[PDB]
Amino acid sequence: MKQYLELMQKVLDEGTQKNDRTGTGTLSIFGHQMRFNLQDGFPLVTTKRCHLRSIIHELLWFLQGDTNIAYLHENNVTIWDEWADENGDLGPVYGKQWRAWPTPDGRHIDQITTVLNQLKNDPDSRRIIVSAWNVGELDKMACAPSHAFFQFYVADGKLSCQLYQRSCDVFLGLPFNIASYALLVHMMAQQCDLEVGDFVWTGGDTHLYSNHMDQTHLQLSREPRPLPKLIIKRKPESIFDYRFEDFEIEGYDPHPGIKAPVAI
Amino acid sequence: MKQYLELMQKVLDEGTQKNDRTGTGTLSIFGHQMRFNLQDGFPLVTTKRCHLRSIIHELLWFLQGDTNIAYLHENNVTIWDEWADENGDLGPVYGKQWRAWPTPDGRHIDQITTVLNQLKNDPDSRRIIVSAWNVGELDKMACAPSHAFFQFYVADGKLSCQLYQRSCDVFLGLPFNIASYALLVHMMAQQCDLEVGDFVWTGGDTHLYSNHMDQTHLQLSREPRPLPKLIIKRKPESIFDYRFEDFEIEGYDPHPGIKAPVAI
Ligand SMILES: *SCCNC(=O)[C@H]1CCCN1S(=O)(=O)c1ccc(C)cc1
Ligand SMILES: *SCCNC(=O)[C@H]1CCCN1S(=O)(=O)c1ccc(C)cc1
């Protein structure tokens, strides 16, 4: 997409050479923001085909609050396979913190139920937030949350959401992360009876891996296509009742997918 | 400063007229990002006289982990006085979370000491983060954090910092928050033998209260002056040992102070 393709070119032109924990290099910048008006269309990258299948399964898995990858296994989603332990456990990563953030005194906080009630009873709140950044549980996680904190906002009947992404693999993770959050906004807008507003994406350490450079150069030579349109075929009773088949993307016409080596 | 007046002009030109928790009335935009290269000068607003006295006191108080206004009220700092209980307590707000985030297993994490060690030993880490967003303890706090989460980053010997400010009073709070974090960045860079890089400010619900409108347009009729300069006079043994008198501002020649009323 245009903002996506400008950010890629910005990392190339001004990123500085950095080394990651894996000994692979990166070109990196710090501080970047893009805004997607979801009424202009579903923000799925069109300069390389992006499969939504796993994105959709992951989001539902998150909202259900389980962190073991058996559900992903049941639908053959393998994006989390390498962090899981022998029992398929990730520790208390995203979904555990979204639905059951553990308190000092033994209880759990359901941040999705909270934001849904704030959106419905107090939509002008300035603290309609969900944080995955549970400092006291970072050491138990298979990985520290990348897409770390998000906030919702309502204006003129429209629901917007901003994500702070402390660490961003521009080529491989970003298209995935942008779709995931746009998806959730549509879902929440429907459950709160709102229209969709903007998806504001803000990055911390925003980088392109050194072995993503040919694929980036190839992707910058293509021209973006008009954005697709998301169709939710059925309005379920609550935000926790979506099923994979509820979502359809229409008008998606991407250039060919581009394969990139994944860095562990 | 230029970035600061551009943000005021943006809220006035794009903002949505809404109300506050008290119902006061705001003009707000959702999502914004701006940058201050700290080698250009210490980002203290000059379109109205701002006093660094209180900001320094508040930051040393935060850094001690303190949440009682006693130290602030001794040094005639009254900015927290309306939130404090009859004992002067604010609850586990900012400084408590910075220095002793309570984990579910009964540990306490010192986030500042953690980012200090990560700056010295793993400056390329993509998780050098301090979060005040302790979901579990928000409702024990006199108010939920405004300047909720910040991240450090190092490139070419310079220390940068990005803050995610989930609610921003642009006219009254913002000048104080930008100067607070820029002072923090100078202190950390001093402790890690780094030079200062950029302060990146990102906002969530970013608003002007409607009783600050004439003050805001008064400010907007003035030209930004040249940025003052910060001189630190000593290199204390740790980031926790700075004193008020180690800090000097040079070249500060602001337009006149502009008073305005605060929100409850
Ligand atoms: S575990 C270290 C950082 N990686 C991640 O969190 C990965 C694990 C699977 C999902 N995320 S992702 O960054 O959103 C992602 C998604 C898809 C691909 C191909 C790579 C990364
Ligand atoms: S407790 C409700 C929100 N108010 C604050 O968090 C205040 C208390 C003092 C620090 N903050 S502030 O938003 O940074 C601020 C600073 C200075 C003035 C004059 C007003 C508000």
What CATH number is given to the structural domain containing B192?
3.30.572.10
Is the four-CA dihedral B94, B96, B99, B102 of positive or negative sign? negative
Report resolution in angstroms.
2.2
Residues of chain B with Cβ-Cβ distance to A197 below 8 Å are: 30
Could you give the 3-state DSSP secondary structure of residue A21?
Answer: coil
Identify from B19, B115, B135 which residue to disrupt to test chain A contact, counting A C-beta atoms within 10 A and taking the largest count.
B135
Largest CA distance in chain A: 55
* H or E element that contains B12: helix B2-14
Residue A178 Cα to ligand 1 middle (Å): 13
Q: Are A72 and A61 in contact (CB under 8 A)?
A: yes
Task: Please indicate whether residue A150, judged by its CB atom, sits closer than 6 Å to ligand 1.
Answer: no
Is the four-CA dihedral A40, A43, A45, A49 of positive or negative sign? negative
How far, rounded to the nearest angstrom, does the alpha carbon of residue A63 sit from its chain's CA centroid?
A: 13
Whole-Å CA distances, A52 to A57, A94, A245, B201, B248: 9, 19, 12, 32, 55
- Return the residue whose CA atom lies nearest to atom 19 of ligand 2: B172
How far, rounded to the nearest angstrom, does the alpha carbon of residue B22 sit from its chain's CA centroid?
A: 23
Work out how many domains chain B is built from and give that number.
Answer: 1
What is the domain extent for residue B51?
A: 2-264
* H or E element that contains B31: strand B26-37
In chain B, the residue whose alpha carbon lies closest to the alpha carbon of A23 is B124
Phi-psi region of B41 (alpha: psi -120 to 50; beta: other; left: phi over 0): left
Q: Are strands B195-209 and B26-37 parallel, antiparallel or unpaired?
A: antiparallel
CA distance B156 to A73: 43
* H or E element that contains B2: helix B2-14
| Tokens 């220390």 belong to residue | B159
Helices A174-191 and A111-121: crossing angle, nearest 10°? 50
CA distance A27 to A11: 6
Query: What is chain B's Cα-based Rg?
Result: 18
Among B137, B149, B166, select the one facing A127 at the smallest CB separation: B166
Whole-Å CA distances, A253 to A15, A47, A55: 30, 9, 18
List of long-range contacts for B97-101, beta carbons under 8 Å, 24+ apart: B97/B131, B97/B132, B97/B133, B97/B134, B97/B137, B97/B145, B98/B62, B98/B63, B98/B65, B98/B130, B98/B132, B99/B63, B99/B64, B99/B65, B100/B65, B101/A135, B101/A136, B101/B131, B101/B134
* H or E element that contains A16: strand A16-19
Burial class (CB in 10 A: 0-12, 13-18, 19+), B30: buried
Beta bridge partners of A169: A207
Beta bridge partners of A196: A159
Q: Are B93 and B145 in contact (CB under 8 A)?
A: yes
A164/B202 CB distance under 8 A: yes
State the smallest CA–CA distance between residue B74 and chain A in angstroms.
32
Q: Are B31 and B203 in contact (CB under 8 A)?
A: yes
CA distance A234 to B16: 32
Phi-psi region of B33 (alpha: psi -120 to 50; beta: other; left: phi over 0): beta
CA distance A54 to B153: 32
Amino acid at the residue A133:
W
Amino acid at the residue A218:
L
In our burial notation (b when 16+ CB lie closer than 10 A, e otherwise), range B35-52 reads bbebeebbbbbbbbebeb
Whole-Å CA distances, A160 to A27, A232, A239, B73: 30, 18, 16, 40
Could you give the 3-state DSSP secondary structure of residue A93?
Answer: coil
| Tokens 């419905």 belong to residue | A120
In chain A, the residue whose alpha carbon lies closest to the alpha carbon of B114 is A135
DSSP structure string for B135-158: GGGGGGSSS--SEEEEEEEEETTE
Burial class (CB in 10 A: 0-12, 13-18, 19+), B89: middle
Residues of chain B with Cβ-Cβ distance to A156 below 8 Å are: 16
Query: What is chain A's Cα-based Rg?
Result: 18
Q: Are A213 and A9 in contact (CB under 8 A)?
A: no
State the smallest CA–CA distance between residue B135 and chain A in angstroms.
8
State the smallest CA–CA distance between residue A252 and chain B in angstroms.
28
Whole-Å CA distances, B182 to B42, B52, B57, B155: 7, 12, 14, 17
Q: Are B227 and B43 in contact (CB under 8 A)?
A: yes
How far, rounded to the nearest angstrom, does the alpha carbon of residue A62 sit from its chain's CA centroid?
A: 11
Q: Are A147 and A177 in contact (CB under 8 A)?
A: yes
Of the candidates A117, A115, A125, A128, the one whose C-alpha atom is nearest the C-alpha of residue B26 is A125
Among A148, A160, A202, select the one facing B202 at the smallest CB separation: A202
CA distance A136 to A104: 9
Which ligand 2 atom is nearest residue B169's CA? Answer: 13
| Tokens 């306490």 belong to residue | B108
Whole-Å CA distances, B51 to A178, B165, B234: 41, 21, 22
Phi-psi region of B106 (alpha: psi -120 to 50; beta: other; left: phi over 0): left
Other CB atoms closer than 10 Å to residue A93's CB: what's the count?
Answer: 22
* H or E element that contains A160: strand A158-169
Q: Are B199 and B38 in contact (CB under 8 A)?
A: yes
Q: Are B248 and B230 in contact (CB under 8 A)?
A: yes
- Experimentally, the structure was elucidated by X-ray
Q: Are B66 and B108 in contact (CB under 8 A)?
A: no
CA distance A149 to A203: 11
Cα A137-A183-A224 angle, rounded to 5 deg = 115
Q: Would you state the structure tokens that stand for residue A24, as one six-digit string? A: 């692979």
Could you give the 3-state DSSP secondary structure of residue A71?
Answer: helix
Phi-psi region of A106 (alpha: psi -120 to 50; beta: other; left: phi over 0): left
Phi-psi region of A254 (alpha: psi -120 to 50; beta: other; left: phi over 0): beta
**Choice from A26, A146, A264 to test ligand 1 binding pocket (greatest atom count within 8 A of CB):** A146
